[PDB]
Amino acid sequence: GLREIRVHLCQRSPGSQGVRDFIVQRYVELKKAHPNLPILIRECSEVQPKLWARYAFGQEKTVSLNNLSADEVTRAMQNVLS
Amino acid sequence: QLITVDEKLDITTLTGVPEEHIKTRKVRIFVPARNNMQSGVNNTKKWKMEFDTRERWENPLMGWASTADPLSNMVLTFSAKEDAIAFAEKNGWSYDVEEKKVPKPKSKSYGANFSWNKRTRVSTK
Amino acid sequence: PTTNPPTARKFIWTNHKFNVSATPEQYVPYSTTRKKIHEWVPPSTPY
Amino acid sequence: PSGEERCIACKLCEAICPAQAITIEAEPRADGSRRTTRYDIDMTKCIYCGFCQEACPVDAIVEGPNFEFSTETHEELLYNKEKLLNNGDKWEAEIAANIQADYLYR
Amino acid sequence: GVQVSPSGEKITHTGQVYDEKDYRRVRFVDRQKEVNENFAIDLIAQQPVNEVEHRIIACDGGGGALGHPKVYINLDKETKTGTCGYCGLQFKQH
Amino acid sequence: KRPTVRPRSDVTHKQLSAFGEYVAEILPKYVQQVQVSCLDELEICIHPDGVIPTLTFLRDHTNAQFKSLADLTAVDVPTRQNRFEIVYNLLSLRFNSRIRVKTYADELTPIDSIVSVHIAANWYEREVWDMFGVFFFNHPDLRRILTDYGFEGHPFRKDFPLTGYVELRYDDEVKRVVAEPVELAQEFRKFDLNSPWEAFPAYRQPP
Amino acid sequence: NLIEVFVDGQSVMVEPGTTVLQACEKVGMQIPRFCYHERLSVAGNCRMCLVEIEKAPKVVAACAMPVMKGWNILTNSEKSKKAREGVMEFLLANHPLDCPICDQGGECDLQDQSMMFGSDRSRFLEGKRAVEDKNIGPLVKTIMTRCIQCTRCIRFASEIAGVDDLGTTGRGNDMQVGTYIEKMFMSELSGNVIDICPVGALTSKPYAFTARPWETRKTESIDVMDAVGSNIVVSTRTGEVMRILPRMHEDINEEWISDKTRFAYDGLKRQRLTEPMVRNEKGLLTYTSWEDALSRVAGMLQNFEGNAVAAIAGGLVDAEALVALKDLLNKVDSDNLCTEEIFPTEGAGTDLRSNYLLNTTIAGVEEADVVLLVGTNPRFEAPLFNARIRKSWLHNDLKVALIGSPVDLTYRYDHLGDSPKILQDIASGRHSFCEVLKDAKKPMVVLGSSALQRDDGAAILVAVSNMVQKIRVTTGVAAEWKVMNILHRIASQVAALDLGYKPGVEAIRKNPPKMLFLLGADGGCITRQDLPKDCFIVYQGHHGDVGAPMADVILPGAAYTEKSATYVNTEGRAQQTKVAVTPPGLAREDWKIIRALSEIAGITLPYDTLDQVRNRLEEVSPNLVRYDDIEETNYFQQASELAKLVNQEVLADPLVPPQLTIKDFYMTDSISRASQTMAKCVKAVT
Amino acid sequence: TSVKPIFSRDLNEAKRRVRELYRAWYREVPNTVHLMQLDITVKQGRDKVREMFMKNAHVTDPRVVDLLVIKGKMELQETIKVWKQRTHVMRFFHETETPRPKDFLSKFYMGHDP
Amino acid sequence: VYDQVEFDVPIGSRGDCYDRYLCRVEEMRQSLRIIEQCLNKMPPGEIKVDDAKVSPPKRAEMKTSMESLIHHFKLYT
Ligand code: SF4
Ligand code: SF4
Ligand code: SF4
Ligand code: SF4
Ligand code: FES
Ligand SMILES: [Zn+2]
Hints:
9 chains; A: alpha+beta; 4 strands; H: mainly alpha; binds iron/sulfur cluster; binds FE2/S2 (inorganic) cluster; electron transport (chain A); mitochondrion (chain A)
C-alpha cells in the first residue's frame, strides 16, 4: 500500500535532465489523475537525482534516476506506483 | 629518509581529553559580527573557534552560575578559515562553519537629498 | 575622641558587637535577589 | 550622610578584580533610581589588593582596617550586600577619618 | 523598617523571601539571617526637597570631592522635582 | 626634548643591524628573517636543522661570545602549520649585549637539542616537553617536572583550558585522594574586552 | 568608468559618486564617524570625519566629499589628528559625567574614540549645560543632556518609519532633539534608535540597569516571531538572557529588527513549563517524571493506531520535531500531521517550492519596478519586507498598489478596492492598472497567507495565477525573473509544508481521532468539544494559556534560544539557531523527547543524535541542510496550468487583514501574550 | 605525504618497540602492587594495561605511535623508580565515578547530554 | 637612574659559600651607601606619568572633568 511520493533533483545539471523533462512533460497528468496523493518535488543543487516513495506502515523505497530520460522516468514511476 | 603517507592527521590521543569532551562537542567556526551599538570593524577581521554551550545552572547556596564543562569559555583566534579547519579536523572535533557576512557598496550622492523630481527629498535639515 | 570626636551620624551601630564566630547570632550566606524565572500556576478544576 | 547607599552598579570592581571574586546582579529601584540586588564577595579569593577602592568613583567600597574576622567555617567568608552594609554602618566612624586623611595623596 | 513574612523570615530590602516549601532555609535553623534595618528608600524619602533660584544646579554629593562627580541638573519642569542619579537628592526651582 | 618618551637612539639600531648582516652572510643557510626591533633588540629566525650550528657559532666565535643562555622559552600560535615558536634569549659579557633566536616547530616534528653546549637547557627542555608537547632528541632525562607524575595533556597550549579537566578530593569510602571531573561552583567569567576602534594604524593588515 | 586614487602612496580604483570614506574602507583604514550610517542619509554635523588632502590646503569631511581623480589622501597626519582632538574637546565640553550610569558604558563609540583619537584631559574650567527629559514611550528611556546632536534618529525616522514627528527645536547650545509635545513615538520599528544612537541617551527601559556588555557571552541565533529570518545576537549573563540585538545580514534584516522580537525576551521567563504534568483521578494536573509520562503515553500508543492518532503543530516549533513526528506516525501508519494554520491546497497544494514561498528573493524588491499587495498588512506581519519596500519606493521611483481596506501606511499609493473580483477584472484588462503593468517591466505580486487563511482562498489563488499568466504574456520576462509571491507569518509553516503535511484541520473535522499530539500550538483552533469525550491529548510545548488547560498530559520542550534547530523564512532560506542557554528544570529537547517515546513504545528510530537527524533531513528534503543558500525553481507555469483546471470561485464579501490597530501587532504568540512589557506597550497605545 | 620521520619509519618498527614496552609493563606490575600496598589483582592490572593499549588501535602514523611510546616509557620510569603512589596509580580506574550511561534513555532521564 | 649614584660591587676569589655569604653582607652595606644618596637627592615632582591613556588620573579631575573620567573607565575595564 503506497502512501506518498517525493522526488529529489539537482536543477541545472546533466543527471537531472530527464527528470526535468518528465516534469515539464507529463507530471500534470499524474497530478490531475490522482490528486488525493502527496507528490512532492524538491530540487536542491549538487545532489544525485533520486526518488523516495513511502508506503503505509512507514517503510520506504529509494531509487535512482541519474543519466536517464523521460521514458525511464515514466516506467520507474509506474513500477513503483504498482 | 622522508615518508610517503597520505593519511589525514589526528592527535586526539596526545591531546589528553576524554571521549565525551572530544566527540559530543560541536565546534563552530565563525566571524564575530559587529556590536550594532558600536560602529567598529576591527573585530570582523579574524576567524574565531568556539564550542557549543552546555549546562549552566545556579548554585543553591548563594546563586552563582556553575558549569560541568571547562571548554565553554575556550575561544580561539585564527587569521584564515583553511587554517582553522586544519586545526579543528586535526584535533578531531566536528566543525561547522558560518560563512562571511560582508557589507555591500553604496552610492551616497548627498546632493540627491536636495533633489527636484525624486522622492529622496528630505523635509529636514 | 575626647579631643577629636567623630561625625555625629545616624544609621550607625550604637551597641558594638564582639566576634560572631559560632554564636547563635552568627552570619550565613544567601541570595539577595528574587526568582529569575516564574512559572505556570495550573488551575484547580477538572476541565 | 543622607542614609543612601553609594553603589550604583558601575561594575568596575567586577571588571578589575584580578580574582574575579566579586559577583554583581543589578536592577532598577521602585523609586526609579539605579541600584543593586546582589553584591557578593568571596573573601577566600580576595587577595586584598585595593583595586576596587581605587576604581569605585564614589568611594563606596573601601577595604578597611579590621583584620580580626577569622572564623570557624568557610561560609562566614562569602560576604554579601547586607554583611557589607552592616560592616559599613559599623566602621564608618573610622573610615571617614582614614579617607579624609588619605584622599589628597591619591 | 523591616517587615516579616508568614513564616517569620525577615524580608530583605529587596523582597527576598524563602517560601514555606523551600529547603534552602535550613542554614537559618539554630542561626540568624543577617539584614540591615536602615532602608535607603525611606532614608532618602525623609530628606527635604532642596530649593534654588538658578534654574540649573550642580550636584556633587556633599564634600567637594568624596562625592559623586559634578552633575548638572535642569529644573525648568515645574510639574515636579529634579533628581540626581547618584545621590538620590532632589531639587526644586524658585 | 619630551619628558614622557624614551630616546630612540641610532648606535644600537646600527650596530646590531651590522651584526645581523654579518651572521646572515656567514650562514646564508640555517637562517631566514633576521630583524631588529624598534626598541634595540635583535631577533634571528632559523630552520630547526641549524640550531646547534648557530648556537656553537654564537658561543665560540670571538666576535659574539654569546655565552649565557639567559632563557629558553616556547610560544604557541595555532593559525599556522608549524605552530610552536621556540625561543632562546642569549647574553654576552665582553660585548655587553643580548640576542634572540627563534625557530619554528610543530607537534609531530621534534627538535635538535643543545645540551652539548648550554647545559641550562637540560631542564627548560623538560619543561617544554611536559607543558607544550614539543620533543627533543639526544636528551638523557626527559620527564614531567612541573605537573603531577600521572598528569596527562599539555596545558600551556591555547586549547587545554584554564580550569583543567580534573579536580581532586578525598573520599573516605576508600581513604585515598582521588581525581574526578571538573564540576566547578562558580563559572570562569570571560570578559569581552577587545575594543574595535583601531589605535595602531601602522600595524594594520589589508584584505 | 573607473577612477583612481593614491592613498598614502597606496593606490585604489573606485567609481564616481563615491566618498572618501568608502575609499578608505576599501583600503581598510576605518575613518571616525558620528553622523554617518551606511543605511541612512548624510550630513556634516559631527565634524569628526576630517582628513588632509595633499596638494590642497583646506580639510574636508569624508562623509560628503566625492573623490576627485588624482587626490592623495592623508588620514593619520598632523592637521587631521589636531582637528579630531579639537572636535572631541568640544563634544566632551558638556557631555555630563554619567558614564557609569549610562547603560551604553562599554560600547560607547564616543568613549572609544576619546580614548584612542582624542586627548588626555579637558581645558574646560567652566560650567556645563543640561536639558529637560522627555517621555517618548514605555520602551525608549530618554535622557537628553547627552545628545551630541548627530541627527541619526531624525533621519532614520523621516526615511524608514515615515513617522515624521521627530525633529530639532532651537538654535545654539539651547538646541534639543525630540517632539515639541509629549507625543509617543511608538512603531513596529521603534526599538532600533537604541542601536543607532551611539550614546546612552535613548536607552532601552527593560534592559536598562540590568547588566553591561563585556560581562556577556554573545551567542548568535534567529527570530521566530515572524517568518523573515532576522539574524540575532543573544546576550547571556551567568546563564541567563539579558538582551537581544540585530545581526547584520545584508539581505533579510539589514541591521534592523522588530520591537516584538527584541522585547519579547521576557516572555521566556513567565508562564513557563518545567515538569511533566499529568491528569489526576479528579482531573487536576499533578507533577511527575518522564518515567511515568512516557510509560503512560507509550502504553496507550501501543494500543491506538490507524487514523485515530493526529499530530498538530503550531508556530515556534522546529523542523527536527516535525520530521521526528512524521517518521513516528509513519511507522505507526498514520498521516494526519497538520498545522494550526490554513493554506488552500486544492489543485497542486504543497508539491512545488515554486509555490508557497517567495519565488523572488526579498532583495529583488530593490530592482523591481511595480509592486502589488493582496490583502496584507506587512507593516504588522513581516515589517522588514515593508522597509525594503520603503527604501525602494524612496530610491528607485517605484509604484506600489494594494488590495484591501484603507490601511495606515508610511507612504501613499493607489488603492484598488476590497473585492478580489478586481483580480479577474485585471486578468481581463479593464482597469488602468492593467495598462500600467503591461507598460512597466519586472512587476511583482505578493499575497499573504493571512488571506488564504480565509475560506474562499483557493479560488482567489486561482484567479491570481490567471492574472499572472495574463501579465506574463503581456510583458517580456522569463522565469529568471518572477512575478508571484507568497508571504507567510509563522515560521514552522514552511518547514512543515516542505516535509509534506496537511496544512489545515480538514482531516480532523473529517476523522475525529482518539490520541492528539500537539506541539507549540497555543492557537486554540481545537478543544474538547470538537472531539469525542474519551480522547487523550499530549501538549508538548513551552507556554500555557490555551492548549495546556485542555490537556491530558503536558510535556515541556524549549524555546528559540535553547534548541539548535533549523528554521525557514518565506524564501526557502535555511537558518539554524545555536544553543545559547540550557533550559529550566526537567525540560528537554523535542526530538530527544520523541526518540525516547519511540524507544519506550518499541518503535526505535535510528536517530540517536542531532547529526543523524540532519542526515535524515538531507534524505527527506535536501534544501533544509543547505544553510544560507536559496534554491530557485521554475515549474510555476505547470502549477498554474494545473490550477486552471479548477473552477472554484470566490465569495463577494470584502477582505481584511485582522491587524489594523498597532495593538494587534503585539499579543500574537505565547511570548507576546506573556511578556509584562507588551502590556505596557498596549496600555500606552490606548 | 612528504614529511620527516621520528625514531622510526614504519608501523612495524613502531610495533616492535610497542611490544618491548608491553613486556616491560607486564613484568613490572607485580613489583608495584607489592611495593605500594595496593588491593587490586595482578590480573586486573594487566587488564588495564591491555585496555590502555587497545584504546589506541585506530592509529596509523608512526609518529603518533612513537610519541605514545615515549610517554609510556616516561610513565614506566616514574613508576618503577617509585614516585607515583597509591593515588597516582589508582587514578586510572575511575573508582569514584558512575559509568557514564550510554543508554539514550538514561541520558534523557538524568541530564542534557545528547 | 642606577647610572647616577655610586655603589661598589663585591666579588670573591675562591667560590665557596663563605665568599657568597660575604658578598651578600657587603651588598647589604652598599645598599645603604645607595639609600643615603637616594634620600639626600630625591627631587620633587610627580609620580605617575601624565599620559592619562596609560596611568589613571587623580580623583579630583576624574570627578570634575570628563575625558579623564572616560580614561578612568577604560583603564579599569
Ligand atoms: S581588594 Fe579584593 S575585592 Fe577589591 S579588587 Fe582587590 S581582590 Fe578584588
Ligand atoms: S566600583 Fe563601587 S559603585 Fe561601581 S559597582 Fe563596584 S562597589 Fe558599586
Ligand atoms: S554616551 Fe555614556 S559612556 Fe559615552 S560619554 Fe556619554 S555618558 Fe559616557
Ligand atoms: S538622540 Fe542620539 S541619534 Fe538622535 S540626534 Fe541625538 S545623539 Fe543622534
Ligand atoms: S561623519 Fe562627517 S561630519 Fe559627521
Ligand atoms: Zn547628587
